[PDB]
Amino acid sequence: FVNEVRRCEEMDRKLRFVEKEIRKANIPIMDTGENPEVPFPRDMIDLEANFEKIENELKEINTNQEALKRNFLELTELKFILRKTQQF
Amino acid sequence: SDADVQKQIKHMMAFIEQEANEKAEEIDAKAEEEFNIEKGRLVQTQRLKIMEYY
Amino acid sequence: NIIAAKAAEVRANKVNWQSYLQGQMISAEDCEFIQRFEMKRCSEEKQEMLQTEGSQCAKTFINLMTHISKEQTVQYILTMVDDMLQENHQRVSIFFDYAKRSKSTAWPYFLPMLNRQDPFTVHMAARIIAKLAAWGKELMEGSDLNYYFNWIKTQLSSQSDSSQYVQCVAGCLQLMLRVNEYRFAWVEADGVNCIMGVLSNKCGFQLQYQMIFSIWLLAFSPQMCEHLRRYNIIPVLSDILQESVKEKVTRIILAAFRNFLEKSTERETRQEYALAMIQCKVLKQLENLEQQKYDDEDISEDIKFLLEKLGESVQDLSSFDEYSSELKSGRLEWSPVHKSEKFWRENAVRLNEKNYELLKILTKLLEVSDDPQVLAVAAHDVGEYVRHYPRGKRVIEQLGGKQLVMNHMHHEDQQVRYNALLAVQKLMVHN
Amino acid sequence: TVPSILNRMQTNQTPPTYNKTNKFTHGFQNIVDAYGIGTYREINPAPYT
Numbered sequence: 001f002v003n004e005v006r007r008c009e010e011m012d013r014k015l016r017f018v019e020k021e022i023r024k025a026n027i028p029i030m031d032t033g034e035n036p037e038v039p040f041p042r043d044m045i046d047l048e049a050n051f052e053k054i055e056n057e058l059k060e061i062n063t064n065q066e067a068l069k070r071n072f073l074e075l076t077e078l079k080f081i082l083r084k085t086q087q088f
Numbered sequence: 089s090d091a092d093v094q095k096q097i098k099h100m101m102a103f104i105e106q107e108a109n110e111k112a113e114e115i116d117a118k119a120e121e122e123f124n125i126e127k128g129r130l131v132q133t134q135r136l137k138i139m140e141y142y
Numbered sequence: 143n144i145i146a147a148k149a150a151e152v153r154a155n156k157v158n159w160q161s162y163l164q165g166q167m168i169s170a171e172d173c174e175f176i177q178r179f180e181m182k183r184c185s186e187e188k189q190e191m192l193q194t195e196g197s198q199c200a201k202t203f204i205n206l207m208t209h210i211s212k213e214q215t216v217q218y219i220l221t222m223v224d225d226m227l228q229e230n231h232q233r234v235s236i237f238f239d240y241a242k243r244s245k246s247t248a249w250p251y252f253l254p255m256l257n258r259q260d261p262f263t264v265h266m267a268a269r270i271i272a273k274l275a276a277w278g279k280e281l282m283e284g285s286d287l288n289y290y291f292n293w294i295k296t297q298l299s300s301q302s303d304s305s306q307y308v309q310c311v312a313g314c315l316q317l318m319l320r321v322n323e324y325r326f327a328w329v330e331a332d333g334v335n336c337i338m339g340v341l342s343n344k345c346g347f348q349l350q351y352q353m354i355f356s357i358w359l360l361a362f363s364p365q366m367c368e369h370l371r372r373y374n375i376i377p378v379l380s381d382i383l384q385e386s387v388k389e390k391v392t393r394i395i396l397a398a399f400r401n402f403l404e405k406s407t408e409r410e411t412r413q414e415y416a417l418a419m420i421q422c423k424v425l426k427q428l429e430n431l432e433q434q435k436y437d438d439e440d441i442s443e444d445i446k447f448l449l450e451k452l453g454e455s456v457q458d459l460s461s462f463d464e465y466s467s468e469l470k471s472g473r474l475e476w477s478p479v480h481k482s483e484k485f486w487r488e489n490a491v492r493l494n495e496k497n498y499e500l501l502k503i504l505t506k507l508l509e510v511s512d513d514p515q516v517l518a519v520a521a522h523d524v525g526e527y528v529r530h531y532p533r534g535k536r537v538i539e540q541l542g543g544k545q546l547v548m549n550h551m552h553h554e555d556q557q558v559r560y561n562a563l564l565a566v567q568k569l570m571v572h573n
Numbered sequence: 574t575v576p577s578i579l580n581r582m583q584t585n586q587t588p589p590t591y592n593k594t595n596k597f598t599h600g601f602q603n604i605v606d607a608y609g610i611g612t613y614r615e616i617n618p619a620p621y622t
Contacts, residue, residue: 003433041385045430064567085301093578100575107390114355114394117320121362 007048014051021058144306145269148262152221153407154212156180159206167210175202179222182542183227200240204251213260220255220266227270231277238280238455248274249286256293261303265310268293272317275324287327289320295333301340305349314350319359331365334373341378350382358394362403368407376402376415389436396431396444399424403451417454420478425452460485462492469503472511474519480526490530494537501527501534501541508546514555521547521558525565535569544569587613 019047022029163173175198182188185489192199206219225231241248252274255267271290275282282290297311321327328334345353357375360366376399383395402415419425428449436442458464460482468477479485493500506529507520524543527534538544547569550562590610594602602619611617 003430040387042387045384060564066572067571068567071570090580093580096575096578110351110355110390113316113399117359117362120320121322 011048011051012054018051018054018058020063020077143309144303144353145262145265145310148217149204149221149266152214152217152262153225157212157215157218160205162210162215168205171198172202172205175199176206176219188226192233196236197240197243200237204237204240207255208251209373213258213263216255216258217260217263217266217328220263224266224269224273227273227277231273233275234274237274238278238368239288241280246311247286248278248280249282253286253289256289256331261307264293265307265314268311268314269317272314276317276320281321281323287324291328291331291333295331295336298333299338300338301343301345301349305346308389309348309352312349312356316352316359319356322363325363326362326366326369329360334360334370334413335461338373338378339373341382347388350386351388351394354379354391354394354398358398359402361398362405364405364407367405368411371411371414376418376424377422377481378538380419380424380427382525384423384427389438389441392431393436393441393444396441396448400444400447405446412451413458413542417459417478420452420455420459420474421453421476425449425456428452456482456484460489462489466500469500469507472507474507474513474516474523476509476515476519480519480522486526486530490527490534493527493531493534493565498537501537501543504537505541505543507547508543508550514553514558517550517553518557518561521550521561521565525561525568527567528571532572538569590615592617592619 021030038047159168159173159176161504162168163170175195179188179199179202180190182191203223205220207216207223210216210219236312237251239246241251249271252267252271256264256271258264258267268290272284275290294311294315297308301308315328333355337357341350356415357379359505360370361375379395379398382391386392399415399419403412406412406415428445431445432449456478459477459479461479462485465485468474468479474480482486493504501524504520504523508524509518511517511520524538524547528538544566547562550558551566553559553562576596590613592602598619601622605611605617605619605622
């Protein structure tokens with residue numbers, strides 16, 4: 001069961017990644033209740049797609065948040081630069 | 089009881105030998121269609137020459 | 143399963159034919175023949191008797207099945223005939239010769255047996271009918287074929303001993319579908335939609351394989367590949383291929399899919415099937431199935447064949463002319479072209495053609511469209527256009543399209559909001 | 574449908590050794606196990622301990 005375990009190994013790394021992002025953000029993990037296993041049917045693939053969805057959204061949205069913020073800061077500096085240079 | 093396990097052994101033995109027949113029916117279905125296709129090709133090859141001759 | 147167990151009990155539950163002779167249910171010639179037949183046990187002994195006495199052979203079995211009401215006796219006769227045809231299928235010719243001598247088809251001797259109350263009796267008739275009609279040169283036709291198919295469809299619609307009886311029904315259909323004419327007649331039967339219904343009801347894995355083997359037989363013939371499109375096969379079988387674990391089911395679906403893409407009459411029908419497969423996530427499943435390993439390499443060859451044919455379909459779909467045509471037709475419906483990274487990476491500059499005509503369409507669709515799919519997809523396309531052609535940001539601004547995605551990031555549908563958010567974020571990512 | 578039932582084995586090597594434990598007994602089993610694990614069917618120091 002190379003693949004099945006390797007998928008679990010990677011899904012655990014994806015869990016750790018999104019969890020580290022959440023813990024850095026200090027967003028509360030709810031930790032409610034206790035749960036059964038996945039079905040034997042291939043539903044782990046839908047779960048894997050959910051892991052990829054969250055990861056890809058974080059990598060994208062984080063990069064965008066940084067880039068957008070950096071642009072806004074540079075343009076704020078440029079607004080002040082233009083207002084002061086308008087004295088000439 | 090070991091006898092009830094042995095009923096499952098007999099079932100699993102029959103099941104794999106039935107599965108061999110099911111694969112043999114897949115092989116039969118492939119081979120009979122391909123046999124009719126190859127027979128049809130060989131017939132049509134000479135039949136075309138025969139039609140051109142007449 | 144049930145019919146084999148009931149047959150083994152019936153083979154033990156023999157009967158004294160002399161009691162039916164004394165009761166006037168059978169002729170002396172029928173009684174003497176069946177009593178000799180119980181004693182002929184070498185293949186040569188059976189051959190000499192059946193070759194010498196073929197008219198009386200058919201007459202005996204036909205009389206003893208037809209006129210007798212006693213189930214255990216008819217069950218035994220049906221068991222002996224099913225065994226006789228299982229030992230050698232060439233014996234079907236004895237019943238056909240007797241039917242021809244009687245100026246009739248063979249079907250009227252056996253079709254009445256499907257009306258009996260006992261499940262084993264009617265399923266043993268279906269088994270013998272399947273052997274008889276599939277191994278015979280005489281064709282089951284019209285009303286006789288319809289009676290057999292309607293009996294099948296009736297038993298199918300019931301869906302455990304009941305399930306094991308239907309496994310015999312599926313086997314009886316599989317044998318019948320050995321004949322090309324009967325397969326094409328079964329495509330004309332709405333019983334294919336019944337099979338799709340039984341699969342959608344998540345029947346046992348045994349029935350999934352036995353039914354899909356029947357679908358795989360239909361999928362072999364180019365003529366049927368064109369006709370059967372109406373039944374939505376690839377969606378149903380793709381759900382089974384994704385959800386079900388069993389290698390048998392997996393193999394026979396991959397074989398059906400290979401038969402569709404190999405055997406279809408048209409490149410367009412192949413593209414219709416391959417597109418439906420890609421839409422039904424089959425390529426993603428095939429890639430996982432390539433990493434899975436098996437005791438039968440035909441599975442892996444079918445995976446490679448399908449992955450290649452779907453790969454060609456992705457290459458066809460990745461044409462900028464198809465992309466252009468879908469935009470001009472407004473068909474922004476997650477056609478796999480939209481998610482083709484290869485297309486966008488290597489072709490995004492092409493949207494500048496005819497004085498930016500495709501971008502004018504994308505922005506006009508973001509202005510005009512109500513459909514959240516068209517909107518989400520047009521936003522996605524604007525996003526990918528910027529992502530792979532950064533000079534395009536100014537072009538979208540010249541078209542005003544930045545404001546449309548900045549409106550649609552607040553659309554009532556999250557799918558629109560998400561793609562509109564991505565698009566405006568790429569438009570705003572740098573100077 | 575297959576119940577996957579077992580057969581009891583007879584051609585056996587010496588099995589691993591198990592003991593059930595609870596609050597008042599677990600630590601006592603642990604300090605016994607810490608020197609060594611009893612032979613199969615062997616008298617257990619832990620209850621006397």
